[PDB]
Ligand binder design. Structure first.
Ligand SMILES: *[C@@H]1O[C@H](CO)[C@@H](O)[C@H](O)[C@H]1NC(C)=O
Ligand SMILES: *[C@@H]1O[C@H](CO)[C@@H](O)[C@H](O)[C@H]1NC(C)=O
Lengths: 85, 110
């Protein structure tokens, strides 16, 4: 199949007419392969597979409160970047 | 055609095979996992835990092996590599996978 480009989306639950709350959502690239021996001699905890990725993340956003409470943020631009943790 | 952003799937690639003791790195052919996964950060502030990012990963691995040339006396020369029967978007399981990001083409001899 094909996966949808990382791009801004209308958060349909925080979006009010005249004021849409935008959310970066999409697909980015990732590969998983048997970890190189090179890698194996640098790691303390050996892990058999090495994962390389990027996740759909906001290049820029705006902290914004909405619908009374909801402290939310407005994704203004997207990109394939770190998946972090 | 070719999706543009083909979702996580087995792809053919060449794994460099090496074993210390043996002089020659054999580059075998196998299937690795590569493609695209749908992901998206929360816009809503103050949620827990942190919604973790899914990643292209193995699902169904079968193993094959080769015997490296020129190894010495009692060195074992049969190194086995993985073959991706299937792939899938899933949590990069840190206990078992080295979860990171892009590297300049990593499966070459070295
Ligand atoms: C969210 O950002 C978009 C683009 O910057 C803007 O048009 C929209 O009005 C913003 N919504 C809120 C609730 O601030
Ligand atoms: C990774 O290691 C796990 C645990 O030994 C195993 O089940 C899995 O098949 C291995 N996958 C690869 C690609 O080596």
């Amino acid at each position: 199949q094909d996966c949808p480009e990382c791009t801004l989306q209308e958060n349909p639950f925080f979006s009010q007419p005249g004021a849409p709350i935008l959310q970066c959502m999409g697909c980015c690239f990732s590969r998983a392969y048997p970890t190189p021996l090179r890698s194996k001699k640098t790691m303390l905890v050996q892990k058999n597979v090495t994962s390389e990725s990027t996740c759909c993340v906001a290049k820029s956003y705006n902290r914004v409160t909405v619908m009374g409470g909801f402290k939310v943020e407005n994704h203004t631009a997207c990109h394939c970047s770190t998946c972090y943790y | 055609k070719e999706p543009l952003r083909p979702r996580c799937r087995p792809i053919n690639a060449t794994l460099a095979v090496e074993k210390e003791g043996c002089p020659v790195c054999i580059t075998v052919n196998t299937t690795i996992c590569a493609g695209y996964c749908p992901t998206m950060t929360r816009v809503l502030q103050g949620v827990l835990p942190a919604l973790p990012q899914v990643v292209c990963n193995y699902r169904d691995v079968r193993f094959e092996s080769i015997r490296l040339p020129g190894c010495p006396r009692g060195v074992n020369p049969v190194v086995s590599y993985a073959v991706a029967l299937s792939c899938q978007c899933a949590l990069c399981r840190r206990s078992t996978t080295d979860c990171g990001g892009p590297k300049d083409h990593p499966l070459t001899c070295d």
